[PDB]
Amino acid sequence: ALPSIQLPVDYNNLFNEITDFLVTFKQDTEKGPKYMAMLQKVANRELNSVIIDLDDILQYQNEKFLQGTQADDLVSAIQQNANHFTELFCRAIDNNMPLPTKEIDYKDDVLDVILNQRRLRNERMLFPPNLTRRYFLYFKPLSQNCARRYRKKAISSKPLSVRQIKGDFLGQLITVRGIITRVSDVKPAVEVIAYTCDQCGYEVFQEVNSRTFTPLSECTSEECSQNQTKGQLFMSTRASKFSAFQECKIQELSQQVPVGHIPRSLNIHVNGTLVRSLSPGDIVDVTGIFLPAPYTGFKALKAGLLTETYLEAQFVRQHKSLTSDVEERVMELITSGDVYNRLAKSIAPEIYGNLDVKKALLLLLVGGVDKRVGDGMKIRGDINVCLMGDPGVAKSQLLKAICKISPRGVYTTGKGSSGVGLTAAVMKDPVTDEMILEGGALVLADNGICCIDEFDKMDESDRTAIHEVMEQQTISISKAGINTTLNARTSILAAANPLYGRYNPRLSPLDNINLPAALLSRFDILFLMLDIPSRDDDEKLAEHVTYVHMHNKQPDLDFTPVEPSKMREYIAYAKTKRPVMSEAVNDYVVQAYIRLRQDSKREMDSKFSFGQATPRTLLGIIRLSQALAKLRLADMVDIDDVEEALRLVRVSKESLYQ
Amino acid sequence: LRIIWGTNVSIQECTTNFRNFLMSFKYKFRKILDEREEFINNTTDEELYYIKQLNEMRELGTSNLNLDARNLLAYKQTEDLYHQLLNYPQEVISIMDQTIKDCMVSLIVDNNLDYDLDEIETKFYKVRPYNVGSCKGMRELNPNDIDKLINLKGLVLRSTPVIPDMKVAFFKCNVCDHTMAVEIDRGVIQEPARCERIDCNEPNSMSLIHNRCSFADKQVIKLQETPDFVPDGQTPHSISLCVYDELVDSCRAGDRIEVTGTFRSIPIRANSRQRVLKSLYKTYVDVVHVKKVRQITDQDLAKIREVAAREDLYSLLARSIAPSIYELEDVKKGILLQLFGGTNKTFTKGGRYRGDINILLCGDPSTSKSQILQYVHKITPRGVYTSGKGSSAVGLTAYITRDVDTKQLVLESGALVLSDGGVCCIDEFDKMSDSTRSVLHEVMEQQTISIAKAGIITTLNARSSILASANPIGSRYNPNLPVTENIDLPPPLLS
Numbered sequence A: 001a002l003p004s005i006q007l008p009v010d011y012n013n014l015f016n017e018i019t020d021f022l023v024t025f026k027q028d029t030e031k032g033p034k035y036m037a038m039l040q041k042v043a044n045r046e047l048n049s050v051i052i053d054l055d056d057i058l059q060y061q062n063e064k065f066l067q068g069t070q071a072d073d074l075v076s077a078i079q080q081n082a083n084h085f086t087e088l089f090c091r092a093i094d095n096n097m098p099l100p101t102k103e104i105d106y107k108d109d110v111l112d113v114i115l116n117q118r119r120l121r122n123e124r125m126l127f128p129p130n131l132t133r134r135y136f137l138y139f140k141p142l143s144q145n146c147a148r149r150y151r152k153k154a155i156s157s158k159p160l161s162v163r164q165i166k167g168d169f170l171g172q173l174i175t176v177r178g179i180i181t182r183v184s185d186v187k188p189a190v191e192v193i194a195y196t197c198d199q200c201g202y203e204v205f206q207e208v209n210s211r212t213f214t215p216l217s218e219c220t221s222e223e224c225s226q227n228q229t230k231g232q233l234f235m236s237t238r239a240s241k242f243s244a245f246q247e248c249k250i251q252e253l254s255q256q257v258p259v260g261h262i263p264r265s266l267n268i269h270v271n272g273t274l275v276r277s278l279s280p281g282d283i284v285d286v287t288g289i290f291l292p293a294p295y296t297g298f299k300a301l302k303a304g305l306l307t308e309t310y311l312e313a314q315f316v317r318q319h320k321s322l323t324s325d326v327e328e329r330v331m332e333l334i335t336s337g338d339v340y341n342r343l344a345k346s347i348a349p350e351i352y353g354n355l356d357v358k359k360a361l362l363l364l365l366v367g368g369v370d371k372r373v374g375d376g377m378k379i380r381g382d383i384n385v386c387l388m389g390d391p392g393v394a395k396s397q398l399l400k401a402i403c404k405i406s407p408r409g410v411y412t413t414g415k416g417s418s419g420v421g422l423t424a425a426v427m428k429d430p431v432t433d434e435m436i437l438e439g440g441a442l443v444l445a446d447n448g449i450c451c452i453d454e455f456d457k458m459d460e461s462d463r464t465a466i467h468e469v470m471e472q473q474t475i476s477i478s479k480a481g482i483n484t485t486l487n488a489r490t491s492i493l494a495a496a497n498p499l500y501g502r503y504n505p506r507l508s509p510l511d512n513i514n515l516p517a518a519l520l521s522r523f524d525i526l527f528l529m530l531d532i533p534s535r536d537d538d539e540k541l542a543e544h545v546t547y548v549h550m551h552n553k554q555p556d557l558d559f560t561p562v563e564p565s566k567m568r569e570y571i572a573y574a575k576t577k578r579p580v581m582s583e584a585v586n587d588y589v590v591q592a593y594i595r596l597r598q599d600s601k602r603e604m605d606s607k608f609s610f611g612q613a614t615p616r617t618l619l620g621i622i623r624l625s626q627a628l629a630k631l632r633l634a635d636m637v638d639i640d641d642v643e644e645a646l647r648l649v650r651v652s653k654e655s656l657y658q
Numbered sequence B: 001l002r003i004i005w006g007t008n009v010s011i012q013e014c015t016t017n018f019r020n021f022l023m024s025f026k027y028k029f030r031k032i033l034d035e036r037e038e039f040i041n042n043t044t045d046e047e048l049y050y051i052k053q054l055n056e057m058r059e060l061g062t063s064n065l066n067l068d069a070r071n072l073l074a075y076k077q078t079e080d081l082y083h084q085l086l087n088y089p090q091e092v093i094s095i096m097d098q099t100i101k102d103c104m105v106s107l108i109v110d111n112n113l114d115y116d117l118d119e120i121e122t123k124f125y126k127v128r129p130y131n132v133g134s135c136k137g138m139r140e141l142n143p144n145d146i147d148k149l150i151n152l153k154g155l156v157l158r159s160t161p162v163i164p165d166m167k168v169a170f171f172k173c174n175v176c177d178h179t180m181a182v183e184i185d186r187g188v189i190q191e192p193a194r195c196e197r198i199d200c201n202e203p204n205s206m207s208l209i210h211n212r213c214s215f216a217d218k219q220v221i222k223l224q225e226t227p228d229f230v231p232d233g234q235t236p237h238s239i240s241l242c243v244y245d246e247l248v249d250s251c252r253a254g255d256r257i258e259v260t261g262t263f264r265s266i267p268i269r270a271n272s273r274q275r276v277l278k279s280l281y282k283t284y285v286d287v288v289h290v291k292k293v294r295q296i297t298d299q300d301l302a303k304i305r306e307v308a309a310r311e312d313l314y315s316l317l318a319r320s321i322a323p324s325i326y327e328l329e330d331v332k333k334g335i336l337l338q339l340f341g342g343t344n345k346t347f348t349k350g351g352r353y354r355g356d357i358n359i360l361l362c363g364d365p366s367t368s369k370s371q372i373l374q375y376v377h378k379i380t381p382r383g384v385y386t387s388g389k390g391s392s393a394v395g396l397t398a399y400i401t402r403d404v405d406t407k408q409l410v411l412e413s414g415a416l417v418l419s420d421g422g423v424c425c426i427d428e429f430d431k432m433s434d435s436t437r438s439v440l441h442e443v444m445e446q447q448t449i450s451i452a453k454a455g456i457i458t459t460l461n462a463r464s465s466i467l468a469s470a471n472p473i474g475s476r477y478n479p480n481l482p483v484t485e486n487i488d489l490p491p492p493l494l495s
Ligand SMILES: Nc1ncnc2c1ncn2[C@@H]1O[C@H](COP(=O)(O)OP(=O)(O)OP(=O)(O)O)[C@@H](O)[C@H]1O
Pocket: A350, A351, A352, A353, A390, A391, A392, A393, A394, A395, A396, A397, A497, A541, A545
């Protein structure tokens, strides 16, 4: 039949030592046992989880070694095998559960009502213990610090990868380092199922220890022993115990993959209060038990002796507001002074020059006023900045760098992927094969910045969305029978490449690029950065570039790089602020606009300028004054603010020659 | 005294508390409850809000209630039901309907009138509670609140046709032809063993008559999590909703609704043939109340007449349609005249004569024509605002397309057919393709569109009005050159 083998481990002495450790253990550094305190805390319907530390277990072993009596190296037994010690510890907790000391508080708990109703009828006229349980038991991996303190080495907490997980580590407690890619919704998994039986005896309980089960549907009680055909069992959800279950996939980091290989993936299962600890896009260190999946059902026959695997998770270690602190940070930055120039300069300190562009990127980072006028009129406060110019002028570092500053931002590129206009209504998700409404990148960045690199090569299909956002900021959705309009208020940062190379003495700016005049008119600001050879500038550029290669540090200079978290804190605080205008300030704007138009009537010339001024220019003047006012000022806007905005616009306009 | 098994709810006290609540409650107790200051007590304290709705429902005969949770908590003694309903919705609602059964009698015989009450006896009543508790999204739902009333919010994606549900089986005997009806409980049909007729009494002589049973209606709805609450780098989640009886065919596709209902979870089978089930349930909600996000009265007629008696009706609605637009009064005059349209006639001999006005706006590129079109879009009852930049060549007319959910054929009308009897606004008229332009030609000439594809040959009705806006080539419309060169439009289409 089944042969027998002798193994050193005996579970009786282990159980005795667990019972001794629960009572005796004290924190050496409230007084008394460490865990009977938290058990009493649990009994008062406040704590939902019990977490054991193997450092503490080593402390009990060290205490016993100080006494000198032999031990059973419980820490090694837990590491080698952990699926059984969970049940052992659960039984040990159940045996020594303290009484409720205060605030019994039975209000509307359905399971409580069922259990209380059971008592009267059972006594007047044995169930699975897990039904009465509420706490969840988790283990905590070892610490190298405590290990090195008492040697003994450590295996459970070592940050292995997905690839270093061999088949020799199955059934042990290990830790894996990786990035979370997919997380699923929370669903209930049955643990104890209760069937109601046509007022025959009473409801019956069955435990489920697999992913698949069979209903009972036959009443075996003493009163139900009567021979007449009477009916099968019906399930009752209220008297049954469920649990929260979640499954995730972790993927190997790019640094740890060897050359020529493709990264692998691992599956993680989490049950209990630990659910929702992991989200997509997080680099974490997850500890758990590595167990074999049954792989049954279809396609099991072909494998024969091949199994799946998964990791039952028990611990999570993620690697990486209005308060007086941030109230004082802004005051400190105000007392620092030179906020405008320093804020513009610290943006991408590697790149030397293009300081006006850095001023304009700051105004794009902040947003103008979005005022909802009555009778349906709306006015946009978002910023549309396009940066044109010859190749090899740092076109595509500037952009990427701006994406770092604001959390709400997406870097979308040419026809390699379609994300600008992918407001599709069909999503063939493999998990369920049903449609999901999937928004595009333009919709994704709300109150944010959309960085569209290589805008020249992008197709007219995305041009439709770009045209519509600047008009109404509300994306109409695909024609898959939903008729949905989605909010898409966003600011646009575009990078352009002139047609066939560099700037051309062809006079029309429309000839330099493919973009239509109407599309360019909606842009708030246009910047031309042409590469003109000058003997002085090349020397400083070469020196600046080569200093970075010689020493990895950027070239030290009197200019001080402000700390980036301060950048974010000031930018957010400015964004929260709401300006206001006065009647006197806007009167000078009319004079400015009429002077600009009287210039534009004669400004039509062979080479310089793009068409003529439009009322959209007046709108953008106020829109840009918004950000310059939000930068440091409040309440009414200064008159010199309009001068600053006009100066920035005029420099951008004069960039056509330069 | 006796309590329904499992729960702690007893009918005896609940019925009495509810009748006390209904005959006792007023806005007085409600405004004492909320007491948020600046609370009006101007004769509202004695209005008897529940009794007046009860009487108006009795005289109308409709059965719809809007019982609220805060109002239910307002009364001190009935405060128990507030926490007794969240945990046991079904039994409390069963008591609800049973008490409303005699709520009619409690008021019909106060003056001993001659109401029949027999049609009241036959008809049944129910309730639609709302605002049960704090609204929480589907992203936060644990197994800890199964079979408890919740309030959810989400986007409607799709609906399914009516689903039959058996209520009363019907078995006939193939020998003696005897008919008997067997009720079904929770889906399972208890088969008749042998014919009840003692004389017939034959084993295995039963036949099911499918079309002689009794059925009820079901509908299933699909929801999606709203984009506002979703965090970064996530995919929206979905929930299925069960709708029964009068609430079927209420939620249109693409709307955003807040619903109240009972959370539930059921098992689904592992193997289709075997009895075996798998240890992971599916979660859904059974809904009880749904909320979203003609027949003009005589007073409206009188005010319409007196306003129509204004000295200058032309200029007033000239300025009303586009409040933001300054000057450009003449184009507003034309649009106001267009929105009414001349009379339409179709006499037998000559045929139909058109009664729609078509308007084309064009000129320098940075005027405000698009805002004008979006203004006239809203005023008109039925109309469509779609640009002519691209899309399918028959995107404004019928386009036979394969159905996505089912591998079937669906005939989908376009934007010109969907603007029948109204004003259809076209934007960016100059970018419309040479092949689709001809379609508009048959629309503006015969007002009908014919489709002949996939074995389908048919004609639809356009009968709409075209308001279009265009842009020239260049940054200005120089008056010296005539219209034709600048607008890039065929002479007949402009004509
Ligand atoms: N002002 C500058 N300061 C520092 N580096 C600069 C500057 N202008 C250009 N560079 C150099 O240009 C490169 C960054 O821009 P890069 O040429 O890679 O992309 P791009 O400007 O978008 O051009 P392309 O059309 O080739 O993609 C780096 O090698 C960088 O050292």
